Every structure is written in structure tokens, then in C-alpha cells.
Swiss-Prot record, chains A, H, O, R:
Taxonomic lineage from the root: Viruses, Riboviria, Orthornavirae, Kitrinoviricota, Alsuviricetes
Quaternary context: The precursor of protein E3/E2 and E1 form a heterodimer shortly after synthesis. Processing of the precursor of protein E3/E2 into E2 and E3 results in a heterodimer of the spike glycoproteins E2 and E1. Spike at virion surface are constituted of a trimer of E2-E1 heterodimers. After target cell attachment and endocytosis, E1 change conformation to form homotrimers. E2-E1 heterodimers interact with host VLDLR or LRP8/APOER2 to mediate viral entry. Interacts with 6K protein.
Function: Class II viral fusion protein. Fusion activity is inactive as long as E1 is bound to E2 in mature virion. After virus attachment to target cell via host VLDLR or LRP8/APOER2 and endocytosis, acidification of the endosome induces dissociation of E1/E2 heterodimer and concomitant trimerization of the E1 subunits. This E1 trimer is fusion active, and promotes release of viral nucleocapsid in cytoplasm after endosome and viral membrane fusion. Efficient fusion requires the presence of cholesterol and sphingolipid in the target membrane.
UniProt PTM comment: N-glycosylated.
Organism: Sindbis virus (SINV)
Residues annotated as transmembrane: 1-25
Descriptive protein name: Spike glycoprotein E1
Entry membrane topology: Single-pass type I membrane protein
Intracellular or extracellular location(s): Virion membrane; Host cell membrane
Topological region Cytoplasmic: 26-31
Segments forming a coiled coil: 1-31
Swiss-Prot record, chains C, F, M, P:
Top-level taxon: Viruses
Effect on the protein of changing S102C: 40% reduction in autocatalytic cleavage by capsid protein. No infectious virus is produced
Shown part of the complete sequence: 114 to 264 of 1245
Effect on the protein upon substituting W151F: 73% loss of cleavage by capsid protease
Species: Sindbis virus
Protein name in UniProt: Capsid protein
Active site: H28, D50, S102
Function summary: Forms an icosahedral capsid with a T=4 symmetry composed of 240 copies of the capsid protein surrounded by a lipid membrane through which penetrate 80 spikes composed of trimers of E1-E2 heterodimers. The capsid protein binds to the viral RNA genome at a site adjacent to a ribosome binding site for viral genome translation following genome release. Possesses a protease activity that results in its autocatalytic cleavage from the nascent structural protein.
Length: 31, 290, 151, 36, 89, 151, 36, 31, 290, 89, 290, 89, 151, 36, 31, 151, 36, 31
């Protein structure tokens, strides 16, 4: 399970960073 | 109750089903198949072997006209010749120059050796599966042969069982198969009366016994050359012997899914194919020790 | 300190301004800056403000316009006359400003720049201007009246 | 394993590239179209 | 009756047809012949029954390939979940 | 309160100033202070500000220049004429300041020092100065325009 | 041991010298080029 | 181990002080 | 499984390897070498001892010419002299003044004592290592001698074993060695036919027996002085006796790595050098008690 | 079967060829002859087997120079790690 | 004086050296080699031929236990069987159902034909070169065989001669070679006791005579099928006959540098390789006609 | 003694192992067996000696490949240089 | 309404005319029309008349020349003076027209175009012109006197 | 046939192209150099 | 014959149209 | 008879001269001759003399400059003033000649060319010129003072 | 021979080319930068 | 020898002409 959560945590970086980039670029343009 | 399960078609593999329901202490039903057997229903189309040529004595007639009549015989040939034996020196010791006619004829009979060794052209039909299955639950170490079809029921330990239709319909046997004692060959033999010269099936008879025989050896009568009365002919070698060489792919060799092949009932043993949907109807009594 | 922005036909469709160290022009004004040096600079867009800017060459930084965020209510001036600033809005008479005027500065009585005209909104009696300004901290602001037409 | 190790790192390098490229380019454009 | 029952595995091998050593443990009363099973999806064990009359723990044998899977194994009626690391044969 | 810094050939290449208790000169000015006492002092570098300083002897501390950080926009003066201070920059006319002028003070209307000239940046029309100043808390500041040449 | 005792103290005296000289000279220059 | 960590801790002083000097002189010049 | 290990070449040191793998309870294989033996393959180059000089009777001939012919003998010398015995008073009781000739000759034969005591010049070749090794695991207290080379296999307890090539190739024996019964001397003897005078190898014979002998004593014939017929000569003392003194460094003395030296098989015992890469092929059966 | 098993050392001497006194301890069932080993790299012990039938703890003897090293010592199949201070001979 | 020269190793090529020095009229020394001969020193490692299988009579014993003991014989096999001949009808005419045991055994002996024809595995060692060389100068048409090594001296016409080490060390013979009478084969035979089944060296004996034989035919005893007491076995064909086919590259075929190959002394004749550094020590007398 | 001695060649062939016909010529006194040689680098001749007692000229045989080379050939002690055109065999 | 046609050397070798909705020039005049727009138009040849034409851009169609086929005998005018039209021929004084004059219009007293000059024929006393005209129906006509040299 | 079918249509498409191009371009030029 | 006259009639289109174009362009220029 | 040589920016960096049948310019002056004809001629380098020449078109050969090798000591003239010729050297006042002056002729009192300026050597008090001249036989000569800078 | 015949003519054509090209171009440049 | 001197004389043309060109271009520039 640890090899499927540490390896499954790096794939969540594109679902984590792109969201932390899209939630920071849509809030700075709308305010 | 009415339990339903499926089990892979694999010999010697212990199977366990855990049925637990309602107030009843759970129950473990274990059943593993002892041995399958795919037996296609076959119908002997015909039989073939090597033949023996029979050539009657020639009918020479000086200065007279002969005329052969049709005959029932297999591959029966006959031909009236003329200008056969010119003079006395002609070989006939006949008078007339060419007025002489000679009746020639010949036919094919199944060789003598045939009853001993021959081959059978059969028709493999929608096969059925046997099964050695051994069911158990509580106390029922007993084994029971049954048909693996959607219909056939069977009761064990007061429980109805149906090993439903095999998950698939696969067989190592084609529509037409041939057996030369001990070896089964998928093959496409010619139909009865279809027989071709110098090839398997040149002569065919429904049974080893059957008084009737169909043959097409391309037996051809020849003209006698003046010198000595005789009746020559041209024929094609036995189609059977030829076949002995081009037997080819034996089913006994090819293993698919572990199938084994046996000639006496002509079946495939212990193939590992598909799953057998088990279905039962157990009584509340079975659930014993609730 | 103000330069023409020309279309392919050579006509003046707007203006560029040398102010606070840089050349700046309204982005909607699509043309060429009428100047040998400034036309060869690569501009950086500031889209939210309809502006486009580039650093001024060393020689132009000297007398570039000075900007001030301090501009209380009253009367200002631009190329076409008096400009009134009241209730947070710069207004001019109707039928005075139009095509080609985008990029022009609004000036105060000391020669300092108070705003940049982007266009205007004909409100029947007066024309309200769409302008770019900066606050005390130097933050860009773009004010646009309803009915604004980008000159 | 060679299918799970290659697929994970496939969207891992692309995760920290597209994820950081969009996070830096947009952060730079946000800081450039704001400081100007 | 069996109470609490805990499963402690020992061996695991991918090899089809049994391997590994599961061993249940419990406390019970009066004792008789207890059945055994595996309610899970896969993971079976060759042993329908085991007997408790001695007033001790039980031992069992099982099968399954999986690198490491869990399965619920009953003992008469009690239950539990088993699991362990595996190794190739 | 201002002393010449001479090269080996005796030529004036810069100036030293007596202000707020010390002698100070721009570090880039490599020469000797034209004074019997001040030339024998050991200076402490303040490199980030292109300055070098030493404590003034007791007798010079009396009339040393007074420095003030309060210097609003307007006109100041230095040895060569009027100096304008606007937008945080001190500018002089082009072609007025040059070699030897580093070290000279910018004075206000009360005889107080407002900045120290390090050099300048010829911006075609005007010359922007590179200067050393101090804020209210007395912290050193060095402002340098692009194109600055250390006189 | 005499190789480990000499090498350690070799970069120990030089550690607290160069480390404190750079930490004091830079701290003094930071306090001098700021207070002035 | 204690003689290799107390003697290995003094060598980390030049990697500790020079860093606490370089991270304090680069931050005060850039701010 | 196929386990692989290495063990130092040291006698009497118990070795333990712990093999634990897969489902099987771990296993402890202990094997310690009882005694090595480095035996170089040698080839007797030749033998040497002290010699015995043989001088035949002189052949005096008054007023006549003698002439010695070549002879097969070892270090065979001969010389015809003239002006030997001037007159009757000359010692020959010859007539002519100088016309007289005397044939002198002599040769060297291996001394009698040689078969008893002698020395052998040998050629130490790429040595091989024995080994007393005692392997054990579970129950196999048994010991087994084997060759320590990359090849030689050996089965114990149904397990193949190979004590691979010794980690190094070192020997106390040089290319040429010499043995004077009981003591081995690394040495560089002269080659056969190489023999030098007054030194080891002055006389050499392939075997103690071999009818052939090569000798170079620097045996030199001398001229007779008139007075009494005789045959004088000059020779160099036996090279062998001389050697007895300069025997020098015995291998028996130098200990390297604890090696012991024994003359009968001419080997080095229990040297402690290198490691022996053990390699086994154990059956799953061995893993017993899984 | 042996369970938990703990290792308590007593003596340690650098001297090659055995010294020190390792003593394993455990609880077991039925008991038979248990084997012994040392899975570690070095650190051995002269004793291939020991027997548990008494239902008690075991004692053992070992070797090794190291000033203080740890090693895994099995007992039939169970395991553990041992270690202790040392002294010169 | 002490002249030094070199001459190519080539047969039948006249060589001329012109030595002119000091006051002496120059001198022409001509010497051309008659024939070289590279003879490697070999050591017969072992011998191989085809074998003959010997199978003793079976030892049947009703209701009793047999047990074969180990035997010295080559590839000696034996095995006690049980449940061999079930009953009297069993073929043994024995009583007990399975209590019967049968001792089977067999071994390999060198075939009879071996002494006649066989092959020898040899070890080619640092070869030496002969030489037919014919030297001349002034008057010395004489030829003289000598060794071409750095050492061996030889006097002709009162002049010392040394044909120094051949300029190189090349040989057509590898470390291991094999001879099947008349043909030499470079080869890598297995070591003694190394022998592999169904391949060259399956049986090996140090000499044609040597009473001892090592064999590894993979001779395997088989179980008797009840019917008639006998002792069956499985073996691998002779490795020797197999070799007869894969003899392969004969040295006799490959010519390198013109080398010729002869089996009796096992050498290479007249190879043309390298130069022979001649070295002489001529007396002032030789310089005759000064 | 031989005086003046001149060399007149006749044939030349590249073929290794002798060809061509060198023939020396001279005037001499008393005469005896004269030796022969070739002091040059290469270019040899199969003939160690020749005899002059007749009071005439000599003949000789030689070898060498070279298309045309010169070599010094002595006759007892006298000398000379030879050379000539060549041809392939 | 008349534009220069220049050679590669920039010299005027002829003229183009804006008349009746199009730009037109004599085909034999091989050069570039001295105009940013007209030089980028693709012309259609009317070879039988030594003319080449293109449609005038919308802005030029306004004041393009007006053509009239009604031009009775009398005196007309062109760039170089009076032009006489008699016996169906337009004549000018000798030594007046030449190189570069092809493309020029002949005008009447009302500012309308009566013909286009292609060249002329020096007839010793007077110069007869080769001209392009149009009839009442608007059909092109090209009249060429013998001895005509295409200017 | 494939030689007769290709050759006919070869000068057929070229017949109605060059034939209509010369008939339309010349008709257009005749109507343009006349209407003007 | 019909396939050699309908297919031979399309090739006569370039000898029919080009003539009906050349006889219409030479007559309108000469009149 | 003198033409500008322009850089890509249009600035005059030197001169070309029509003299004795040809156009000539200093080779070090890398630019375009400001003339429609002369710019299209292919020049032949005379590198040893830092010159480049081409034959003058027929129309320019008429009034091309005349050169004379006879020029005794005294005062001459060029575009920037008096030029002194003494001791074989042409000198002008310091701070008078510079960039762009290469190619200019030195003239005598009769309108004839005496030398061509290539550059000069600031010798503190006076500036010595690097010049191209010709002797009586018409042979090219290039005289260069030490310290010469090619303008 | 084919190695000696090709190598000789290799530097022979290149001898009379580079040798004459440098002898004519330099002679022409010497006569041109002198006659001018 | 004649085939090695006539063929060896053409290779001396680049060592003959280039020298007669280099000794004629360096003397005319230095005088």
C-alpha cells in the first residue's frame, strides 16, 4: 500500500499543483 | 436455499464456496471435478481401405458382335473392341479380318485386408460433456458422474444440482473427423459417392460389412494389342495407401487446453475450458447446525 | 513626450507617451509608433488595464512626463480643452473627443500627468472618459463608464 | 511492475513539469502584469 | 462457541494449489467439530473442518497467488480477517 | 570644509568633506587629501556606498558641515550651479559636471548638506547624479542612475 | 587516532576562526555600512 | 559514535557559521 | 538452491553460513577445512652426487705413434704425448729419443655412494591444492577430501559442491627446486648438460639409475715428467661436496603464512592463504523442515 | 514453535575463537530439537542446535572480536537480534 | 674474434657474412640451415578408445533382501530392485508378492580393439628447435645438428658457435594436442577423471596398458519389467566413435609459415619463422691468410 | 695476388635463390685457392671459393632480386664493384 | 489625377492617369507608378491600344478626370501649350513634346479629357500626335500618324 | 481499350478547357475592349 | 462505330470550339 | 566633384572624389556613395594606398578635379581652413579635422588637388595629416605620420 | 606503380595550378596595384 | 632513376614556382 500511495502521490501533483495554480490565477483576476 | 455458483473447468482443483445466509451458521460447500470428457456424437459416414481389382476373362468372338450390358459392380467398366485379332495368326485363331469383337470388363472390390485394418469417416456432432465431479458439504465425500448441460439435474445429499451449460462451446473436433484406429484426425473426407481417384475415399462403403461399395479408381479398359488375347487396363493406385502417407496432423499430438484424446469412445479428456455454472437447491435441513 | 501611433495607411489612430521611465500606449490601438527607436522596442502587455509598455531609452528618460496620483476635484486640461474631474470621473464636452485620442494624457496645472484617456462614453450632455490612473502606492487602475467606446 | 513504475513516473515528471511550468509561468505573468 | 478468534498467517506462495500456513486462535466452550471456510472472493483453503474439543487453538492450510491479500475465514460461525506478505515459489 | 584629493601629478581628481564629525570621500577617488592632518588618518571603507571615512580631528569638528535628510522637491545648489531635485533624483544641465567633481556636496538654502555627488549619467538633455544621502534615521543610501559614470 | 584528532581540530580552529571572522567582519561591515 | 559526532560537529561549524553568515549577508543586501 | 559463498583458507576455523530463503525455515551450513596441501607437480630434471675418477693404464709405445679415438665416456679426456721418455733411462726403457708417444686418458663416473645419497633437480609446476574440508548441514558430520579448483565437483548429502579456484596463486616453491632428502631448497640448478665445474651439477644423470651421465669437472690431462711412466691430471673438486656447504635457505625454515614443508610428496601443508569460494547446488529436499 | 524470543548476552571478548555467553529465551510448544544460527554477516557461534522439550529457556555460546556488534540469531525459525559491550581478553 | 650475426630461419637459403677486421684479409663465413624441427615436449595425459559394456548375471532372491556393495570397477553401477517378479508367474518362479529383490550391476571396460587403434591426449610443452645447419668458412663443408637456444654451444673448425634463441616463440602446437595416429589435432580434451559422456574422453586411461580406467558413459541401470529376469540399462554411445566424426582441423592441413607436421616424433618441420642469432668465437688462427 | 680485377655481369633475375652470372677477371701470380664474398649489404652469391692457378679469369654465380644493384665482390683480398640490368623470372 | 511613372533610376519616363473610374497608362512606358497604392494594383493590358489599366481605389474615384468624345475642331491644351485639333488630328509645335510625355492628357476648355498622348510624329513643321480616344459609345480608338515615335 | 479511353478523354478535358478558355477569354476581351 | 464517333466527337470540340473562337475573333477585328 | 559616403544610418562617414577620370575614395571608409550612378560602379582596390577607385561615367569626366604633383612649401586649403605644407608634411590646427573628413582633397590656389586626406595624427600642438599624393610620373604615394588615426 | 603514378600527378596538376595561380594572381596584383 | 627524377621534377614545381612567386612578391613589397 505504501508503494501505491507514494507512487500515487506524485501523480496527484498535477492534480495538486495545477489546481493550486488555477485557483490562484482565477482568484487574482476576479478580485 | 437456491444457491448459484460457477467453478472453473479444471481437474483436481479444490473448490470452496461459502454460503452464509440468515440465521443459519455459514456452510462450506466444496466440489472439484474429477475428470471431464468431451464426446462428440458421431455418425459413421463410410469406410475406406485399399481395393482389389477383379478382371474377368475376356470374351472373344470371331466374326460376331458382342455387347456388354451394364452391371451393378463398383467402378464397373466394360468395352467391346473390334479389329482385335486380325487373323488366325491374330492370336485368336480367328478367321475374319476385323469382324472379331472382344468384350473386356473389370471392377473394384474391397481388398481382403480391409476388415482387418481400415479407416472411418465420421461426422462429429454437437458434443456433450461428461463429468466426474465430487461434491461435498458436511458429510458427502461421494462422487457423482453427471452431464454438464443446462438441463440434467442430479440429487446428492437431498440437494438438487445442475452443472449448467459449459461457459463455452469449444471442441478439438471438427464437423468431419476420421479415425484410423487409435488416432483421430480432423479432416474433410469426401462425401459418400464423392470419392476421388488415387485419394482417400476412392472406395467407400457405409460399413465394413455393407455389401455395397462405391469406387472411383479411374479404372480404364485398354485395347488389346494383337499378339495374345488379354485385357489390359489403367488404374490409379489405391487412394488409401496414398493417405497413409499424408495422414498429417493427428489430434493426439495437439494438446489444446490440455485436452487428451482417446479413440475408443473418441473423446477429449480433461480439457481445461470454460467454467461450470453450478446451481443447487438446498433444503433448510442442509443448513443444519443453524 | 507624446508620439503618434500610425495605421498602415499612415493615419494617426492613437498615441504613446513617455512617462515615469517608460513608453506606454493603450493596447487596443493597433499600429506603429512614429519614432525610429520606440518602434523597435518589444512591449509588455498589461491587458487588465488596456495598456502596453516598454522601458524608455536612456536619452528619453530625462524629460519624460511626471505622474501624480494627487488630483482633487476641479478642472484639468488635455489636448482638446478643459477637463472636469468630479465624483471620481473625468468629463469633457460632448462632440469634442474621438478617434485617435486614445493615449493622450490629462494634465494638471503644473505640467504633471493625472490620467491616460482610453476612450469615452457619450452621455448625451457630457462625455465621460475611460482612463488609466495610478494610486498613491503606484498601483494601476482602469476606470470605465458604461457606454464607453474605445476611441 | 515495469508497467506501474513507468506509468507512475510518466505522469510524475510531467506532473512536476506541467505543474511547475503553469505554476511559475502564471506566477511570473501574474507578477509581471501587476508590477508593470 | 468460539470467541474473539484471531488469524495469524505464516507462509504465502503465489503457486496455485495451496501453500502458506494460516493458523486461527480462539477460546471456546464444550467444543465439537468446527467447520471452516473463506467468505472472501478468492483466496481459498483446503480444509472444510477442524475440531476444538481439546480447548486449544487451531491450525490450517490455504492457497492463493496474490502478493498479499486478506480474506475472511470463519471458524464454525465466528469469523476474522487474515493477511500476510508473500513470496514466489 | 572641502579639501582636494590630488593624484601623483598633483591634479585634483576629487574632494573630501568635513561633515557630521568626520572626513569622508568617495572611495573610487584614488589620491591624497590635500591637507597635512587629514592625509595621515587611516580611513574605514563603506564600499556598498562608494565612500571612505575617518574621524575629524578635534579642531575641525567645530565648523564641519551639517547634514539634513529633509530635502523636498525643488532647487538646490552645488559648486557648478543650480541643481534640481524631483522624482527622487538630483539633475543638473548637460555638460556641466565631470572629472574631479566627485566628493562635492549638494547644498540647500540654509548652508546644510543634502547629498554627496559620486558621478553622473548624461541622459542627453540633462545629467542625472549618482549621490550618497542619509535618511531620517541616519542610514546611508546610494542612488545611481543607469548610465552613471563615476567622475 | 592521531590522524583523526589532528584533522578534526585542523578544520575546527579554522572553523571557529574563518566562521567567526566572516560572521563578525560581515556583521561589523553590515552594522557600519548601515549606521553611517 | 559519540567521538565521531562531537568531533564531527566542530567541522560542521564552518558549514554552519559560514552559512549563517552568508544567509545573513545576502538577505540584508537584497531586501 | 544455488548458494554461493567464500571461506578463508584457514585450518580449524569453524565456518558458518546462514542460508535463509523463501518459504523455507533458514538453514545453517557449516564447513571448516581440515588441512590444505599445496603439491607442486614436479619433474625430475636430473640427479647429482660426488663422482669417482677413472684413469686407465697409460699406453706407452716406443718409437711409434699412438692416437686416441673419441670415446662415449663422461668428461672423457685423452691426449697423445711425445718426447715422453727420452731413453731407456727415460723411465720407459725405450730406445728412441723422442719418437715415443704415450696415450693418456681418464673420465668421470658417478661415485659409488651416489645411489645412497644424492640430490634431485626438479621442476616445480603449476601446483594444485588438496583439502581435508569437513562440510555439515543438518546431518552430515562427514569429511571429504577434494581438489580446490574451479572444476572439481563433489557430492555430499545429495548436494553438489565446488570449492572454486583459490583466491590467489601463491606457492613457496619456485620454478626450479632441489631436494637433498628431507629438505627442499628453492634453487636455480644448471640445466642438464649445463653442469659447471666444481659446483652443484658438475655431474648430472636423469635418474639415479640412468646409464648415461654428463659431467664437466674440468678434468685435464697432464704431461708426464720423465722419471716413471704415469698419467697425471688436474681436476676440480666435486661440485657436490661444495654444495653441501652452500646449501643455504631451506624451505623447511621459512614459515610463510604458516606453511609447513614435507619432502616425501614435496608439498606445503596448511598454508593459510586466500579464500576458497565454495559453491553448492542444494536441493529443495535439503531445505527440509520448511 | 517458539514465540517472541529475546536475546540476553553476558560476556564479550575480542579473542578469536569463541567467548561471551549468549542466552536466548522463549516460550514454546510440544518442543523438539531446535537448530541455531547467525544470519548476520560476521559474529558466529559454536552451536548448531539446542533442545527445548523441557519447556524452558535456552543458553548458548558464541565468538567474534567486535567491540560491540549485533547479530540476528535464529532458534528453529524464530529470530532476534543480540548485542552487548565488550572487553579485551 | 667474437663475431655476431643473425640469419633468417629459412631452409636452403645460402647465407653469407663478410667479416673483415684489422690487419687480416677479410673472411667469408657462409652458413645455411638444412632443416629445422620444432618438437614440443609432450606428456601423455591419457588414452581413449571405444569401450565394451560388461553386465554380470542378475542376482535374484525370492523373499530376501539383497544389497550391492561398492566396487572398484569403471562407471560401476548397481541397484537392488524390489517388487521385481510378483509371483511364480512373475518370471522368477518366486513365492512372495514383492519381497523379492534383484541385484543388477554393470560396468565399462576398454574395448578390445583399443590397443590396436586409439588416441592420445598429450600436453605440448615449451618446444625446442633442432637444426640441420651447415657452416662453412675456408674449409669446413661439414654440417652439424644443433639446438637453437641461447645456451647450447658447439664447436666447428675450432670455432665456438651458438645459434641463439629463435627470434620468436611461435608454434603450431597448443597447450593440449591430440594424436590419432598420423594426424595431430590441436585440441582441448577433458582432463583425466574429467571425461564426459558420449564425447571424446568418456573413458580415459593413462596408458594403453594401465590397469586403471576412468569412464563416464552415463551408464544407467533399469528396472526389470516382470516377464523374464534380465537387467536392462541405458547408456550413451561411445564418445570415441562420435569423435571420429568431429575430428576437424588437422594440423597436417594447415601450412603456417610452411610448417610440415609429422606424427612420429610429433613435430613441425622446416617452419620458416624468425631469425637465428648466430654468435661465434673465432680464433686469430681462423683469420688465416692475414 | 690478384691485381686490378674487374667485374662483368651477365644475367640478373629477381627470383630469390640465385640467378645471373657474375664473372670476375684479373691477373695474378703463383696462384692458389681464392676465396669469394660480397661485402655489400644484400646481394649474395653461392660460392665461397674459386681457384686461380691456371693463370686465367674466374667465373661465378650469384643471387638477389633487385632490379639493378651494385655490390662489392672480393677475390682473395682484391675487390671490385659489380652491377647490371635485371629482368623478372 | 496624373502620376509619374519612374524608371529604376527614378527618372520620369511617362504618366498614369485617374480617369473614368480607373488608373491607365500607356503600355510601352515600362516603369513604376509613383504612388503607394497604384503601384500595388495588377494591371490589365489593352495591347491593341498601347494601354494598361486598373480600377481606381474608392478614394480616388471621386475627382478622377471626366472624358468626353465630343471635341470639335479647334484649340485644346496639354501640359506644354496649345494643341490644335483639325482634320481628325491633334498637332503641336515641333520641338515641344518628347520623352516622358506619354500618358499626358489633352484637355478641353472645361477641364475634361479629350485624348491621351502616346507619342508623336515630327512632320518637319508641326508634330502630329499618336493618341488614344473613345467614341460616343465608349469604344477605344488609337490613332497613329506615320513617323510616330512612342515617347 | 484503356489506351483509347485515356487518349480520348485526354484531349476531351483539354478540348473543353482550352476550347472554352479561348472562347470565354476572347469573348470577354472582345466584350471588354469594345464596351470600354 | 458509335463508341468511336461519340468518343471521336469530343476530340473534335477543340477543332470545333477553337475554330468557332478563331473565326469569331478574326472577323470582329477585321470588320 | 565630391560626394558623401554614408553609413547604413545615413550619416556621412567619408567622401569620394571625381578626379583625373575616376571616382576614388579611401578604402577604410565603409559605406555607400551618395549618388545614383557612382553607387552602382564596381571598385578596384589599391590597398597599399588605402584607396578604392572606379572609372567616371562619360558625363562626369568633364569637370573632374585636376591633380598636380607640384606643390612647394606653403599654405594650401581644404574644407576646414588653411593647411600648411612644410618638411614634406601637411599640417592643420589641432581639433579641426576628424570623423567624416577622410576623402576630402587638399587644394592649391588654382583649384587643383594636391593631396587626399586619409586621417591625421594629433601631435598635441598641430595635427599632421595622413595623405595620398602622386609624384611627377603619376606614381601613388601614401604618407602616414606616427599616431595617425584613420578618420 | 599505380600508387607512384597517381601520387606524382596528384601534386603535379596541383603544382602547375597552385604554382601558376599564385604566380599569375600575384603577378597580376603586383602589376595592378602598381600601374594604378 | 629517370622515371623517379622526371616524375620527381614535376612535384618540385610547387617548390619551384611557389618559391619563385614568394621570392618575387616579398622583394617587390620590401624595396
Amino acid at each position: 500500500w505504501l508503494f501505491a500511495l507514494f507512487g500515487g502521490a506524485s501523480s496527484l501533483l498535477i492534480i495538486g499543483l495545477m489546481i493550486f495554480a488555477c485557483s490562484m490565477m482565477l482568484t487574482s483576476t476576479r478580485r | 436455499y437456491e444457491h448459484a455458483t460457477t467453478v472453473p473447468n479444471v481437474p483436481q482443483i479444490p473448490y470452496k464456496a461459502l454460503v452464509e445466509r440468515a440465521g443459519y451458521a455459514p456452510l462450506n460447500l466444496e466440489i472439484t471435478v474429477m475428470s471431464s470428457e468431451v464426446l462428440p456424437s458421431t455418425n459413421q459416414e463410410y469406410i475406406t481401405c485399399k481395393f482389389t481389382t477383379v478382371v474377368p476373362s475376356p470374351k472373344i468372338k470371331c466374326c460376331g458382335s458382342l455387347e456388354c450390358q451394364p452391371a451393378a459392380h463398383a467402378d464397373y467398366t466394360c468395352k467391346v473392341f473390334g479389329g482385335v485379332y486380325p487373323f488366325m495368326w491374330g492370336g485368336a485363331q480367328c478367321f475374319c479380318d476385323s469382324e472379331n469383337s472382344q468384350m473386356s470388363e473389370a471392377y473394384v472390390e474391397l481388398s481382403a485386408d480391409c476388415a482387418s485394418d481400415h479407416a472411418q469417416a465420421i461426422k462429429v456432432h454437437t458434443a456433450a460433456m461428461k463429468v466426474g465431479l465430487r461434491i461435498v458439504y458436511g458429510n458427502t465425500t461421494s462422487f457423482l458422474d453427471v452431464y454438464v448441460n443446462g438441463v440434467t439435474p442430479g440429487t446428492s445429499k437431498d440437494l438438487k444440482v445442475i452443472a449448467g451449460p459449459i461457459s463455452a462451446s469449444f471442441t478439438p473436433f471438427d464437423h468431419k473427423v476420421v479415425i484410423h484406429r487409435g488416432l483421430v484426425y480432423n479432416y474433410d473426407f469426401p462425401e459418400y459417392g464423392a470419392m476421388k481417384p488415387g485419394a482417400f475415399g476412392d472406395i467407400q462403403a457405409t460399413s465394413l460389412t455393407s455389401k455395397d461399395l462405391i469406387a472411383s479408381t479411374d479404372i480404364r479398359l485398354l485395347k488389346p494389342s494383337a499378339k495374345n488375347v488379354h485385357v489390359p487396363y489403367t488404374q490409379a493406385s489405391s487412394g488409401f495407401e496414398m493417405w497413409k502417407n499424408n495422414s498429417g496432423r493427428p489430434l493426439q499430438e495437439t494438446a489444446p487446453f490440455g485436452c487428451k484424446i482417446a479413440v475408443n469412445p473418441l473423446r477429449a479428456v480433461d480439457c481445461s475450458y470454460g467454467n461450470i455454472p453450478i446451481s443447487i437447491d438446498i433444503p433448510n435441513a442442509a443448513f443444519i447446525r443453524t | 513626450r507624446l508620439f503618434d501611433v500610425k495605421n498602415e495607411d499612415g493615419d494617426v489612430i492613437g498615441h504613446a507617451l513617455a512617462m515615469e521611465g517608460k513608453v506606454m500606449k493603450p493596447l487596443h490601438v493597433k499600429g506603429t509608433i512614429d519614432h525610429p527607436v520606440l518602434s523597435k522596442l518589444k512591449f509588455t502587455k498589461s491587458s487588465a488595464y488596456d495598456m502596453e509598455f516598454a522601458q524608455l531609452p536612456v536619452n528619453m528618460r530625462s524629460e519624460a512626463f511626471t505622474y501624480t496620483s494627487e488630483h482633487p476635484e476641479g478642472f484639468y486640461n488635455w489636448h482638446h480643452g478643459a477637463v472636469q474631474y468630479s465624483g471620481g470621473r473625468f468629463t469633457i464636452p460632448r462632440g469634442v473627443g474621438g478617434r485617435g485620442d486614445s493615449g493622450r494624457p490629462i494634465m494638471d496645472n503644473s505640467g504633471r500627468v493625472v490620467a491616460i484617456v482610453l476612450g469615452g462614453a457619450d452621455e448625451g450632455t457630457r462625455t465621460a472618459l475611460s482612463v488609466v490612473t495610478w494610486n498613491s502606492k503606484g498601483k494601476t487602475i482602469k476606470t470605465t463608464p458604461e457606454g464607453t467606446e474605445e476611441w | 511492475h515495469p508497467v506501474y513504475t513507468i506509468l507512475a513516473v510518466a505522469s510524475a515528471t510531467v506532473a512536476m513539469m506541467i505543474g511547475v511550468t503553469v505554476a511559475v509561468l502564471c506566477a511570473c505573468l501574474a507578477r509581471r502584469e501587476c508590477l508593470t | 462457541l468460539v470467541s474473539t478468534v484471531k488469524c495469524e498467517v505464516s507462509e504465502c506462495t503465489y503457486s496455485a494449489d495451496f501453500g502458506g500456513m494460516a493458523t486461527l486462535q480462539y477460546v471456546s466452550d464444550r467444543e465439537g467439530q468446527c467447520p471452516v471456510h473463506s467468505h472472501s472472493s478468492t483466496a481459498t483453503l483446503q480444509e472444510s473442518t477442524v475440531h476444538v474439543l481439546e480447548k486449544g487453538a487451531v491450525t490450517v492450510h490455504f492457497s492463493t497467488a496474490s502478493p498479499q491479500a486478506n480474506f475472511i475465514v470463519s471458524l464454525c460461525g465466528k469469523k476474522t480477517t487474515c493477511n500476510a506478505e508473500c513470496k514466489p515459489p
